Motif scaffolding. Structure first.
Motif, short mmCIF file in Angstrom:
data_model
loop_
_atom_site.label_atom_id
_atom_site.label_comp_id
_atom_site.label_asym_id
_atom_site.label_seq_id
_atom_site.Cartn_x
_atom_site.Cartn_y
_atom_site.Cartn_z
N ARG A 44 0.82 -1.20 0.00
CA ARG A 44 0.00 0.00 0.00
C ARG A 44 0.86 1.26 0.00
NH1 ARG A 44 -1.54 3.45 4.13
NH2 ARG A 44 -3.46 4.66 3.76
N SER A 45 0.48 2.24 -0.81
CA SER A 45 1.11 3.55 -0.78
C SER A 45 0.49 4.39 0.33
CB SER A 45 0.96 4.26 -2.13
OG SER A 45 1.63 3.56 -3.16
N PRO A 46 1.29 4.76 1.34
CA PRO A 46 0.75 5.53 2.46
C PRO A 46 0.38 6.97 2.10
CG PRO A 46 2.77 4.36 3.06
CD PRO A 46 2.68 4.36 1.57
N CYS A 52 -4.61 11.31 6.61
CA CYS A 52 -3.20 10.96 6.48
C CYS A 52 -2.73 9.92 7.49
CB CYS A 52 -2.33 12.21 6.61
SG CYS A 52 -2.20 12.87 8.29
N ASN A 53 -1.72 9.16 7.08
CA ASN A 53 -1.02 8.25 7.96
C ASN A 53 0.18 8.94 8.61
OD1 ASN A 53 -1.52 6.22 5.15
ND2 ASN A 53 -2.79 6.06 7.01
N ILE A 54 0.81 9.83 7.85
CA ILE A 54 1.97 10.59 8.33
C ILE A 54 1.87 12.03 7.87
CG2 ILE A 54 3.54 8.62 8.46
CD1 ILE A 54 4.66 10.20 5.70
N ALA A 55 2.74 12.90 8.39
CA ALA A 55 2.67 14.29 7.97
C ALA A 55 3.99 15.07 7.94
CB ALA A 55 1.67 15.04 8.85
N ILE A 56 3.95 16.14 7.15
CA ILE A 56 4.94 17.20 7.12
C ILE A 56 4.28 18.46 7.67
CG2 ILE A 56 6.38 18.69 5.69
CD1 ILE A 56 6.51 16.44 3.64
N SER A 84 2.76 -0.88 11.02
CA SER A 84 3.27 -1.72 9.94
C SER A 84 2.16 -2.26 9.04
CB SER A 84 4.09 -2.87 10.52
OG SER A 84 3.53 -3.33 11.74
N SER A 85 0.99 -2.51 9.61
CA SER A 85 -0.13 -3.04 8.85
C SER A 85 -0.52 -2.09 7.71
CB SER A 85 -1.34 -3.29 9.76
OG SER A 85 -1.59 -2.17 10.59
N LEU A 86 -0.34 -0.80 7.94
CA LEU A 86 -0.67 0.22 6.95
C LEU A 86 0.26 0.17 5.74
CD1 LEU A 86 -1.77 3.25 9.13
CD2 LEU A 86 -3.13 1.98 7.45
N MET A 87 1.33 -0.61 5.83
CA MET A 87 2.20 -0.84 4.68
C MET A 87 1.51 -1.74 3.65
SD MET A 87 5.18 0.76 5.01
CE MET A 87 6.38 -0.20 4.08
N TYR A 88 0.44 -2.40 4.08
CA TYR A 88 -0.27 -3.36 3.23
C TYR A 88 -1.74 -3.01 3.07
CZ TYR A 88 3.92 -6.02 4.31
OH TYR A 88 5.23 -6.42 4.47
N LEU A 89 -2.32 -3.46 1.96
CA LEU A 89 -3.72 -3.21 1.66
C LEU A 89 -4.64 -4.06 2.54
CD1 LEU A 89 -3.36 -3.16 -2.22
CD2 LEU A 89 -3.86 -1.17 -0.76
N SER A 90 -5.63 -3.41 3.14
CA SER A 90 -6.64 -4.09 3.94
C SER A 90 -8.02 -3.74 3.38
CB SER A 90 -6.53 -3.69 5.41
OG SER A 90 -7.16 -2.45 5.67
#
Ligand SMILES: Nc1nc2c(ncn2[C@@H]2O[C@H](COP(=O)(O)OP(=O)(O)OP(O)(O)=S)[C@@H](O)[C@H]2O)c(=O)[nH]1
Ligand SMILES: [Cl-]
Ligand SMILES: [Cl-]
Ligand SMILES: [K+]
Ligand SMILES: [Mg+2]
Length: 332
Positions: free
Chosen positions: A8-10, A98-102, A226-232
């Protein structure tokens, strides 16, 4: 599950006080000029740009000359947000996606009210983030190497520039500490889990941007769950509803998780209630280009998260921005 297909693309947000250079940074990375185009000289909507991992590697090569650094994400979806005080709601929505931010801070101004608002959003939602200390070209007597890693350029600067940098950096760290955050200059940071990394950048010269990119990749790979690295399971959200020539009323959607497919029966919320229809066309803009901006579209038979997509389907009139979107399977 943890297969290397089904990667998955975060999602990464850019948040910040007005005129701090969020859109400008994005334009520098994209090699576009969205910022000049904006009506009223302001960002008023959530913007989505997809960056393939190739482009990120290419743009981080200077701070990865040895080539040690490992890229596990297939790509990154990056979300521009408004900085003006009026758009608290859109900042909230973007942050929610978002999962992460700037977090963009103008190095010349430091922390400002919408910086604080953004900080509350990030803290409350436990969003891993890095800080871009933007507009370092405004340091008195700064001398430029285009698109350079920060530390290399900084080594070249005269002692006055270094002195002023360390003053402003110290002030910014004090300000973050007053807000309940411990912050560090990124290569000085020893507790990545708890301390916010600071990346000095220039949207005009492109300096420090490679560092910022490799850092958000790092956020994806070491702080994000880590789960967010993959498609659910599928999750999607409607950003906008607009009439497009030859496509009628269409929706701009953020596909956060799962996979969207042509022919999918979908349900979303309209003013009155639920809308049920079928995906006739699944579109994305060209890579490294805004979903908002008008350009010819790339048609897809399927799209994998996370991506900004335009959906053409009948009966989308009355669709509400911010509504979730569900896929309905054939059997009841
Ligand atoms: N000197 C310098 N100017 C910059 C830099 N980044 C942005 N600017 C300038 O600051 C102004 C604001 O840029 P912009 O990209 O619109 O910020 P923004 O944060 O997206 O603004 P908004 O969405 O909250 S309305 C622009 O005139 C731009 O030229 C930088 O790194 N150096
Ligand atoms: Cl963090
Ligand atoms: Cl664009
Ligand atoms: K602006
Ligand atoms: Mg902007």
């Amino acid at each position: 599950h943890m297969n290397k297909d089904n990667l998955r693309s975060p999602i990464c947000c850019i948040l910040g006080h007005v005129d701090t250079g969020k859109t400008k940074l994005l334009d520098k990375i994209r090699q576009t000029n969205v910022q000049e185009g904006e009506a009223g000289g302001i960002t008023q909507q959530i913007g989505a740009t997809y960056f393939p991992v190739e482009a990120i590697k290419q743009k981080t090569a200077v701070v990865n000359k040895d080539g040690k650094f490992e890229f596990k994400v297939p790509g990154l979806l990056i979300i521009d947000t408004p900085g003006h005080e009026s758009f608290s709601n859109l900042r909230s929505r973007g942050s929610s996606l978002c999962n992460i931010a700037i977090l963009v801070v103008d190095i010349m101004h430091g922390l400002e009210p919408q910086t604080i608002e953004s900080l509350r959003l990030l803290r409350e939602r436990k969003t891993p983030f890095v800080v871009a200390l933007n507009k370092i070209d405004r340091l008195y007597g700064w001398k430029k190497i285009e698109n350079n890693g920060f530390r290399e350029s900084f080594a070249l600067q005269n002692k006055a520039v270094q002195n002023e940098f360390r003053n402003r950096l110290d002030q910014v760290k004090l300000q973050f500490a007053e807000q309940g955050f411990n912050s560090e200059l990124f290569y000085e940071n020893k507790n990545f889990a708890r301390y916010v990394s600071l990346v000095p950048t220039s949207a005009h010269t492109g300096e420090g941007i490679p560092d910022m990119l490799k850092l958000i990749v790092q956020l994806c790979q070491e702080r994000m769950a880590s789960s967010l690295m993959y498609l659910s399971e599928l999750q999607a959200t409607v950003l906008e509803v607009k009439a497009i020539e030859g496509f009628g009323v269409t929706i701009d959607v953020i596909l956060s998780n799962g996979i969207l497919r042509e022919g999918d029966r979908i349900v979303l919320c309209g003013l009155e209630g639920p809308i049920k229809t079928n995906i006739r066309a699944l579109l994305t803009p060209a890579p490294m280009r805004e979903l908002r901006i008008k350009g010819q579209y790339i048609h897809h038979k399927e799209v994998k998260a996370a991506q900004g997509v335009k959906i053409s389907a009948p009966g989308l009139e009355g669709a509400i921005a911010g509504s979730r979107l569900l896929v309905v399977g054939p059997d009841d």
